[PDB]
């Protein structure tokens, strides 16, 4: 789309929109992130506050596979399984769904949200938040620890 470019509409305007006094020189402020702490310091401090310096210790080789764990919050367990099965677990008070969250692909169960009152539900996960446990037990369910 080179015919939509703004330069085309400055075709006979001498300065090409880049100014008559200041001109368009090449790197008049330095290259890349050159002037940080010196003459681009205001830009750096105004838009990237904590840029300079270092904090914390070093993790030499990380291996993110070790600590990878996705989280599902407590208000999505009932939405994990289909609607007619929600209905069928709802009207019947003698059965509860057992959801292996790990199989859907989450490792930890977090506690944000609201479970349905007096609706037991059993959840299997590798990790649980304490509030997630409290809510699951409060609705009459149980948290099963799995690996």
């Amino acid at each position: 789309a080179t015919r939509f470019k703004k330069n085309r509409k400055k075709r006979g305007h001498v300065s090409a929109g880049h100014g008559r006094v200041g001109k368009h020189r090449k790197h008049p402020g330095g290259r890349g992130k050159a002037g940080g702490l010196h003459h681009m310091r205001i830009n750096f401090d105004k838009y990237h506050p904590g840029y300079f310096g270092k904090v914390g210790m070093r993790h030499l080789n990380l291996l993110k596979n070790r600590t990878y764990c996705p989280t599902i919050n407590v208000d999505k367990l009932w939405g994990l399984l289909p609607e007619e099965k929600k209905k069928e677990f709802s009207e019947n008070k003698d059965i509860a769904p057992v959801i292996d969250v790990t199989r859907k692909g989450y490792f930890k169960v977090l506690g944000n949200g609201k479970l349905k009152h007096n609706q037991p539900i059993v959840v299997k996960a590798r990790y649980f938040s304490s509030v997630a446990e409290k809510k699951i037990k409060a609705v009459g369910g149980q948290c099963i620890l799995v690996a």
């Binding site: 590798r126 990790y127 620890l145 799995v146 690996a147």
Partner: protein, 95 residues
């Protein structure tokens, strides 16, 4: 963390012996060559030095022998092994 060879893993994801709960499952020539080669070669000069340091037979002497073997051989375990085997030969020749 450490596992256990028996007593299968608990289904817990964190801690000792964790994980899924699958069901686990489980001299006549060398020393002869050593003797002949020892008879024809002997001991290297630093071996002799360590031997005499051991023969001195004091706590300071054996500490010095460990230091000297460690310096001569590099690393600590190599020096410790050398001093220990030299002690063995010193006893075996002292009998």
């Amino acid at each position: 963390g450490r596992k256990s060879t028996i007593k299968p893993a608990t289904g817990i994801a964190v801690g000792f012996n964790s994980g899924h709960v699958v069901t686990k499952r489980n001299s006549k020539r060398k020393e002869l060559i050593k003797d002949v080669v020892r008879e024809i070669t002997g001991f290297s000069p630093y071996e002799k030095r360590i031997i005499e340091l051991i023969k001195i037979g004091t706590s300071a002497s054996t500490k010095r022998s460990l230091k000297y073997a460690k310096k001569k051989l590099g690393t600590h375990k190599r020096g410790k092994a050398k001093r220990e085997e030299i002690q063995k030969v010193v006893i075996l020749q002292r009998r």
